[PDB]
């Protein structure tokens, strides 16, 4: 907009919100701060007219606090607490994901089009600071192939499963419900099968014609799921440690489908487990 004061007009800021402020809670709280409380909808790109137009325009959206590097920590088995502190505090980089359709809109499949224009944000000063907010200092975008999309989704999946594994491997009086959460969601991609989606999209020779030279990534995905599988094994056994009679039908289904996918990766996927 232009009604903004000089230092505010056409400026992008990042706000260290509260512990659990929803995007719209903070949005409304800012609406309190301002008259002409309106939001455009073109959330990602700017608005050229409103770069010069009056009638101050605003937009809010959570960004991803890009993980910092705790120096000298890069490999030691340091417990999570240190990192979860570093997870959000002492940060300067901020990425923002961007959906996009790039490919044919095949009905059963969304990943034939999935390309992500993650927008990275680098501010001047590292949160937390003397001010609960700061302008962006440099902004940049990204581009993510469905190959990559699968790669990093698979990754974060793996480390999340790890995370639950050790947190319940360290604490005993701990809810089994998250184990149910995870083991369910991973075991049956019931609403839609992500694994078969990988197979139809990438493992298919058709992808090897669309991206012949870019087959060096489907092998990466195979390695990813291969490394997953023993983690699934420890998840299964952790459940067995936390198994209850209610979970027993649950556990048997989990275990049965677990060795099902075991053999699927070993031979049906033909990927080599370690």
């Amino acid at each position: 907009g232009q009604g903004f004061p000089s230092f505010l007009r056409n400026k992008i800021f990042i706000y260290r919100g509260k512990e659990y402020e929803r995007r719209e809670d903070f949005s409304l709280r800012l609406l309190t701060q301002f008259p002409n409380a309106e939001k455009m909808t073109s959330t990602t790109p700017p608005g050229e007219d409103i770069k010069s137009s009056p009638k101050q325009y605003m937009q809010c959206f959570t960004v991803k606090p890009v993980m910092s590097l705790p120096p000298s920590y890069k490999d030691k088995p340091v417990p999570e607490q240190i990192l979860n502190y570093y997870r959000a505090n002492e940060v300067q980089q901020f990425r923002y994901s961007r959906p996009f359709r790039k490919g044919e809109k095949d009905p059963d499949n969304e990943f034939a089009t999935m390309w992500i224009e993650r927008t990275t944000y680098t501010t001047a000063y590292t949160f937390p600071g003397i001010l609960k907010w700061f302008e962006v200092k440099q902004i940049s975008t990204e581009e993510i192939s469905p190959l990559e999309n699968a790669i990093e989704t698979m990754e974060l999946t793996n480390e999340r499963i790890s995370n639950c594994v050790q947190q319940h491997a360290w604490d005993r009086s701990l809810s089994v419900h998250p184990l149910s959460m995870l083991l369910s969601g991973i075991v049956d991609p019931a609403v839609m099968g992500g694994f078969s989606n990988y197979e139809k999209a990438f493992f298919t020779e058709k992808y090897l014609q669309e991206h012949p030279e870019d087959q060096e990534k489907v092998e990466l995905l195979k390695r990813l799921i291969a490394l997953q599988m023993p983690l699934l094994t420890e998840g299964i056994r952790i459940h067995g440690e936390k198994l209850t009679e209610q979970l027993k039908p649950l556990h048997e289904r989990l275990s049965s489908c677990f060795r099902e996918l075991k053999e699927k990766v070993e031979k049906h996927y033909g990927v080599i487990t370690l």
Binding site: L28, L31, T32, P35, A37
Partner: protein, 198 residues
């Protein structure tokens, strides 16, 4: 008093806008409003404060505060001012038509006022008595920018307009106003002021 009355009511708006801004101040300072059927350990009193920007309303299930409004983040500090269809007053309130446990008795017939928003959410509120009930309705229609519905508002209109016109008729003492305006002397078309301007 025919020219007097014409001149009097014809310079109207200043008193009206003064009344309305006073209503605005009253809404902002607000008070602890009254809920519905606050019997079984329910806070009948709870403050509803308007923003100094007069665009959001600080209200919610606040406690039984006899001091009145406490300045803080009420249970909901937003009431969407830009989209309020209306406030229903009297029988138009669906909560008044309730025939179950939320039966409002006929003694709150003139304390029934429900803010219309979301096209399905209503705020069936109760006023402690008539004058402030009309005051809040007046404040809302002031946000709505239409006429007022406080008898006291018409009282103020007449009394202050009378005061102002009365304090103007001092120059015209011992003088009469021709009901037909005095004839305009022909202004010579030349503007070559023999004497200098200013």
């Amino acid at each position: 008093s025919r020219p007097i009355l014409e001149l009097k009511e014809k310079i109207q708006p200043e008193i009206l806008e003064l009344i309305k801004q006073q209503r605005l101040n009253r809404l902002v300072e607000g008070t602890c409003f009254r809920k519905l059927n606050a019997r079984r350990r329910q806070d009948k009193f709870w403050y509803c404060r308007l923003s100094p920007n007069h665009k959001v309303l600080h209200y919610g299930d606040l406690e039984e505060s006899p001091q009145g409004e406490v300045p803080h983040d009420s249970l909901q500090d937003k009431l969407p001012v830009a989209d309020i269809k209306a406030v229903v007053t009297g029988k138009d309130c669906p909560h008044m038509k309730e025939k179950g446990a939320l039966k409002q008795n006929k003694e709150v017939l003139e304390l029934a006022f429900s803010i219309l928003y979301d096209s399905n959410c209503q705020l069936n509120f109760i006023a402690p008595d008539k004058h402030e009930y009309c005051i809040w309705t007046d404040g809302l229609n002031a946000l709505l920018g239409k006429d007022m519905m406080s008898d006291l508002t018409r009282n103020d209109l007449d009394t202050l307009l009378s005061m102002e016109i009365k304090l103007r008729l001092l120059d015209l003492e011992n003088i009469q106003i021709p009901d037909a305006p005095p004839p305009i002397p022909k202004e010579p078309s030349n503007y070559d002021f023999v004497y200098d301007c200013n």
